[PDB]
Amino acid sequence: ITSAAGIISLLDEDEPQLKEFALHKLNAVVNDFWAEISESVDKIEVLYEDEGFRSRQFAALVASKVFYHLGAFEESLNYALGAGDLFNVNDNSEYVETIIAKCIDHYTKQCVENADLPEGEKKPIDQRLEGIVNKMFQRCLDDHKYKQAIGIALETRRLDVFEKTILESNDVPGMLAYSLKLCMSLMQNK
Amino acid sequence: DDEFEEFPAEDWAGLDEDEDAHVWEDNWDDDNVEDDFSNQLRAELEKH
Amino acid sequence: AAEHSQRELDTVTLEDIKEHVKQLEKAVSGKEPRFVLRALRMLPSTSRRLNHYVLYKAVQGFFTSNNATRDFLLPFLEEPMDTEADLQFRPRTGKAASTPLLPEVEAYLQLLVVIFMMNSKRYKEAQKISDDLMQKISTQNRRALDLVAAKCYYYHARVYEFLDKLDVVRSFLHARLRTATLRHDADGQATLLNLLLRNYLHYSLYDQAEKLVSKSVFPEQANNNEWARYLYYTGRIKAIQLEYSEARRTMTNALRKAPQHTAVGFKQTVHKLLIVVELLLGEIPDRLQFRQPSLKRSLMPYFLLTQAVRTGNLAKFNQVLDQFGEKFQADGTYTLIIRLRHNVIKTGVRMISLSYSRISLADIAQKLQLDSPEDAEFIVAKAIRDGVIEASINHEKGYVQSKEMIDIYSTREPQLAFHQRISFCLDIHNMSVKAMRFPPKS
Amino acid sequence: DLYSRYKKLQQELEFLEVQEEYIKDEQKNLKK
Amino acid sequence: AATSGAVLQAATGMYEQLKGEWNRKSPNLSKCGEELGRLKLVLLELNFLPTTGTKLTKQQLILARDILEIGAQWSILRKDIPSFERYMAQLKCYYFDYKEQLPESAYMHQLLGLNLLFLLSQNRVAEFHTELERLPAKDIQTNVYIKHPVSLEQYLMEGSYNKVFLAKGNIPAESYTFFIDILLDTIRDEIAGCIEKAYEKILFTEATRILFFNTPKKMTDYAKKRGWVLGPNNYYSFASQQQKPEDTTIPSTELAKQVIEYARQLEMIV
Amino acid sequence: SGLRQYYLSKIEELQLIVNDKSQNLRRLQAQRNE
């Protein structure tokens, strides 16, 4: 409650047991004290960087949370990628939703910019981003909403996942007519 | 309008009547207590 | 006899509420969110005059689609005292009655309900309905609903303050601010920033507020009023810290941006804080205000205070501080007036600099009723360090020398100032010709 | 489906941009 | 619970051991340090920093409060600022957020004022005053223990440097005595800065005289640290001219862009 | 339930932009017609 300076202050101490409770407390109390922790964001970045820390992923998650709340969405996206597995895709939360959307957008932008390039100089894509997008593909399929998965596949230019979603369908000829229509419809690249 | 009813005005408990209510121009210097300028001149002359 | 007049007043208010709902409907249909702001200008007049009869008839007619909202709204409303000439106000006709009410109209109705439950000293029920309304709004997502949502958050804050539970809602306001700044609303963002600053002040938590303000960005398109509130809070937070000049500047901007006629209390607040900050800055605020009718008796403490600061007399300063002490504390400034009490010398030294182009330090000591001239020496040096005065000390002769006057025009300052103002004027024109709508083919 | 609505809106946006630029040009030439 | 009671009893026994250790005329200053190091991990279990008011066991919070107060005393007496500030970080919350139910400490005022004096000594006047805001009014002009920081700061605001330097002799508690020195050095840097920004070619009745040095040579090292020419004896130039910027070159590219932009906005269709 | 909220927010952005643009174009057409 208030102040919220100590939980920060209990972080320099080189005792990797107080660091953990400080981390979880900052998580629990970030939503109302993101600003203050943002002033002290360098410390948590250092802590994440230190591989010795066991709970590095939780630190990366907290760093993404504070960066996201700040407004700087690129740093938040990078560190959210760094959060690894703890990025529970299945949280009906504002943060998770906005960050996944930002991720889909960046992946689409990279894919479009990379498609029209030689095989020599394809910009590498983060594996964490790829994992998150594939997870979102899996969620979309499992919900059974084929149309959304097809659309994300097209925008991202991914033809493999498009092919998957095309086959694993209870309305194969119907959604195949859908696909042809969309092809002759307002999509331009030749 | 957006009347700042949030903010309170001043209480009217005392509300003493205006002492003189003069409205000419106020001015800051009128508060100072001088010494009857003629008196200062006379004292100067006495002291030279 | 007055009952008939009250009845006519109720009928005209019912028609007026019909008009506001019509305006909201037009706004929702026509893709013009600003059209609600017409619907949201007469709220104070409505609240100052509303009545239970009007509220009952409105909720009865407008909520034709009897929904759990109706069951939650009616019971609090007192029923008419054996009304016999009831006209059965039926705003919704045929299809309109059958169809669901628009989210914005329903939000506006809940707003009138909570306001009426606020005017009466009945805070618990008002708070209950307000939580319900907040849940409702958060559940939905719409634009004109967002514009009304602005004032819904303002009234949620007002009720939570009137219940003295300001802390407990900090997280709700924070998440609401986050969603708003994610969704690109302007007025909602301004409202939620202002409310968060008010919450932070209520508990004199200044360091947290400083971080918050330093990190978020005020949208450049708000009202006059939300700009005034943001500016006041930022001015107060600075004055509490040590950046006096910027606090003075932000405050004067606010006072110059407030509504002209209303906000007597607001003007009082800003003026008293401005007086205190200027005094803290070594200048002398002008005497014109003190005799203004709307601030005459609300500043007498400060009138005596300045009379004391000029002709510095610690006896008189102590007399006035002591006598009008509880009042200063009540205002929320006492700390600053104390910061003054040990800076009464500064006015004198600034005066000495303005008046003299070079004076011996011993003369300063004689003029300031000080001890040995070393004390005045040190005070002057610290002053020039602070930037309040422009001079140069030189003891080998033993006189402090003021710096000459430099020619501002020859420099490039005039070009810069006129460029800024010209840019502002061209922007005004582009906006003005943009605002035009030629709908004759409406 | 919502994908189709999305592409429709995006193409509507492109068309509106083209028309706006054309009207600016038309006004500039009509002055002359 | 049984485990909760056992851990609370263990923590209380440890705290009693410490209070017995510290109350001695001559503490050890090392065993106590290691002991605090181990206790930090102990307080972890018992809701070290509860997130909500949710009035819990008064004993746990009181124990943490005493642990923090003794930890802070330990830090100061050990002449380690980082520890003092770290501890104060949580202690201010404990003192402030939870006092709605938890009774006040006996060392409340002394140690808040100790931190305020530290702040003052660290040239952080903005923080000095932000904290001064938090507390009530009566303690400020009534509490002798907090009277020192406020009064000394008022003396510094009034430029009065002799009064502050002489005011050392009167002190609320002996613990502060370490930070009086840091405040003195801080104000010494402040007077050096005042002299540098102010004045023209030294003087002020000789440097050591207004620098309040017992020995004339004591200032040589400090003058060396700063960028002073070290001219004739007690005669050092501060270079108040600041190069007297007079050169002007008519920046044009900016002006040309500005004017072309006026013309652009003037002729575009809006 | 699948990625709807993202489609929804993004379509909301496009809708706001397109509405503002349509108003601008209406004004501009009115001027050109005059």
Short mmCIF file of N, CA and C in Angstrom, two decimals, chain B:
data_model
loop_
_atom_site.label_atom_id
_atom_site.label_comp_id
_atom_site.label_asym_id
_atom_site.label_seq_id
_atom_site.Cartn_x
_atom_site.Cartn_y
_atom_site.Cartn_z
N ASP B 1 -21.34 25.43 -18.69
CA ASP B 1 -20.58 25.62 -17.46
C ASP B 1 -20.16 24.28 -16.87
N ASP B 2 -19.23 24.32 -15.92
CA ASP B 2 -18.77 23.16 -15.17
C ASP B 2 -18.50 23.54 -13.73
N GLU B 3 -19.47 24.19 -13.10
CA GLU B 3 -19.27 24.77 -11.77
C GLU B 3 -18.48 23.83 -10.88
N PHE B 4 -17.38 24.33 -10.32
CA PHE B 4 -16.51 23.52 -9.48
C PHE B 4 -17.12 23.41 -8.08
N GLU B 5 -18.32 22.84 -8.04
CA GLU B 5 -18.95 22.51 -6.77
C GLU B 5 -18.06 21.61 -5.95
N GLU B 6 -17.18 20.85 -6.61
CA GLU B 6 -16.18 20.09 -5.87
C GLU B 6 -15.44 20.98 -4.89
N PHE B 7 -14.96 22.13 -5.35
CA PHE B 7 -14.22 23.05 -4.51
C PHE B 7 -15.19 23.88 -3.68
N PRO B 8 -14.95 24.08 -2.39
CA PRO B 8 -15.88 24.89 -1.59
C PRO B 8 -15.51 26.36 -1.60
N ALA B 9 -16.53 27.20 -1.45
CA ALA B 9 -16.33 28.63 -1.28
C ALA B 9 -16.01 28.94 0.17
N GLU B 10 -16.02 30.23 0.51
CA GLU B 10 -15.67 30.64 1.86
C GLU B 10 -16.92 30.71 2.73
N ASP B 11 -16.77 30.35 4.00
CA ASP B 11 -17.89 30.38 4.93
C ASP B 11 -18.31 31.82 5.22
N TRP B 12 -19.61 32.01 5.43
CA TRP B 12 -20.18 33.32 5.74
C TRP B 12 -20.58 33.45 7.21
N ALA B 13 -19.85 32.77 8.10
CA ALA B 13 -20.21 32.81 9.52
C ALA B 13 -20.13 34.24 10.06
N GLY B 14 -18.93 34.82 10.06
CA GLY B 14 -18.76 36.18 10.54
C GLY B 14 -19.39 37.20 9.62
N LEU B 15 -18.82 37.36 8.42
CA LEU B 15 -19.34 38.30 7.42
C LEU B 15 -19.54 39.68 8.03
N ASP B 16 -18.47 40.21 8.63
CA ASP B 16 -18.54 41.53 9.23
C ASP B 16 -18.78 42.59 8.16
N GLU B 17 -19.53 43.63 8.53
CA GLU B 17 -19.85 44.69 7.60
C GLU B 17 -18.58 45.44 7.18
N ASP B 18 -18.60 45.97 5.96
CA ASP B 18 -17.45 46.68 5.43
C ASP B 18 -17.08 47.84 6.35
N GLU B 19 -15.78 47.96 6.65
CA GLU B 19 -15.32 49.02 7.54
C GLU B 19 -15.55 50.40 6.93
N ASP B 20 -15.06 50.60 5.70
CA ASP B 20 -15.23 51.88 5.02
C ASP B 20 -15.79 51.69 3.62
N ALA B 21 -15.45 50.56 2.99
CA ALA B 21 -15.95 50.20 1.66
C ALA B 21 -15.46 51.15 0.58
N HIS B 22 -14.38 51.89 0.82
CA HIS B 22 -13.87 52.81 -0.18
C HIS B 22 -13.41 52.05 -1.42
N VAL B 23 -13.65 52.65 -2.58
CA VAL B 23 -13.50 51.94 -3.85
C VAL B 23 -12.65 52.70 -4.85
N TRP B 24 -11.90 53.70 -4.39
CA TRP B 24 -11.27 54.58 -5.37
C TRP B 24 -10.26 53.82 -6.23
N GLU B 25 -9.11 53.47 -5.66
CA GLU B 25 -8.15 52.64 -6.38
C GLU B 25 -7.32 51.74 -5.48
N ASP B 26 -7.52 51.76 -4.16
CA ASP B 26 -6.69 50.98 -3.26
C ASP B 26 -5.22 51.40 -3.33
N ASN B 27 -4.45 50.79 -4.24
CA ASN B 27 -3.01 51.05 -4.36
C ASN B 27 -2.25 50.49 -3.16
N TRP B 28 -1.01 50.03 -3.39
CA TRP B 28 -0.27 49.38 -2.31
C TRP B 28 0.23 50.39 -1.28
N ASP B 29 0.75 51.53 -1.73
CA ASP B 29 1.44 52.44 -0.82
C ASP B 29 0.54 52.97 0.29
N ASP B 30 -0.78 52.98 0.10
CA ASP B 30 -1.65 53.59 1.09
C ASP B 30 -1.54 52.93 2.46
N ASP B 31 -1.05 51.69 2.52
CA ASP B 31 -0.94 51.02 3.81
C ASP B 31 0.17 51.61 4.66
N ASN B 32 1.21 52.14 4.04
CA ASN B 32 2.37 52.59 4.79
C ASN B 32 2.00 53.75 5.70
N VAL B 33 2.64 53.79 6.86
CA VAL B 33 2.45 54.86 7.83
C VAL B 33 3.63 55.81 7.64
N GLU B 34 3.34 56.98 7.09
CA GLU B 34 4.32 58.04 6.97
C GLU B 34 4.22 58.94 8.20
N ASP B 35 4.88 60.08 8.17
CA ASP B 35 4.94 60.97 9.33
C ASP B 35 4.59 62.40 8.93
N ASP B 36 3.47 62.58 8.24
CA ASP B 36 2.91 63.91 8.04
C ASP B 36 3.94 64.81 7.34
N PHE B 37 4.17 64.50 6.06
CA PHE B 37 5.31 64.99 5.29
C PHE B 37 5.78 66.37 5.73
N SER B 38 4.84 67.29 5.93
CA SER B 38 5.20 68.60 6.45
C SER B 38 6.04 68.46 7.71
N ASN B 39 5.70 67.51 8.57
CA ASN B 39 6.45 67.32 9.80
C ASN B 39 7.89 66.91 9.51
N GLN B 40 8.09 66.04 8.51
CA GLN B 40 9.45 65.64 8.16
C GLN B 40 10.25 66.82 7.63
N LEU B 41 9.62 67.65 6.80
CA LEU B 41 10.32 68.84 6.32
C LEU B 41 10.70 69.76 7.48
N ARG B 42 9.77 69.97 8.42
CA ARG B 42 10.06 70.86 9.53
C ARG B 42 11.21 70.32 10.36
N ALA B 43 11.21 69.01 10.62
CA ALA B 43 12.30 68.42 11.40
C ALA B 43 13.62 68.56 10.66
N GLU B 44 13.61 68.35 9.35
CA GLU B 44 14.82 68.59 8.56
C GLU B 44 15.34 70.00 8.80
N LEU B 45 14.46 70.99 8.63
CA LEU B 45 14.90 72.38 8.78
C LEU B 45 15.46 72.63 10.17
N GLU B 46 14.81 72.08 11.20
CA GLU B 46 15.32 72.24 12.56
C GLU B 46 16.72 71.64 12.67
N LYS B 47 16.93 70.48 12.05
CA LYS B 47 18.25 69.86 12.06
C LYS B 47 19.16 70.41 10.98
N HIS B 48 18.58 70.95 9.90
CA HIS B 48 19.38 71.44 8.78
C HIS B 48 20.16 70.29 8.15
#
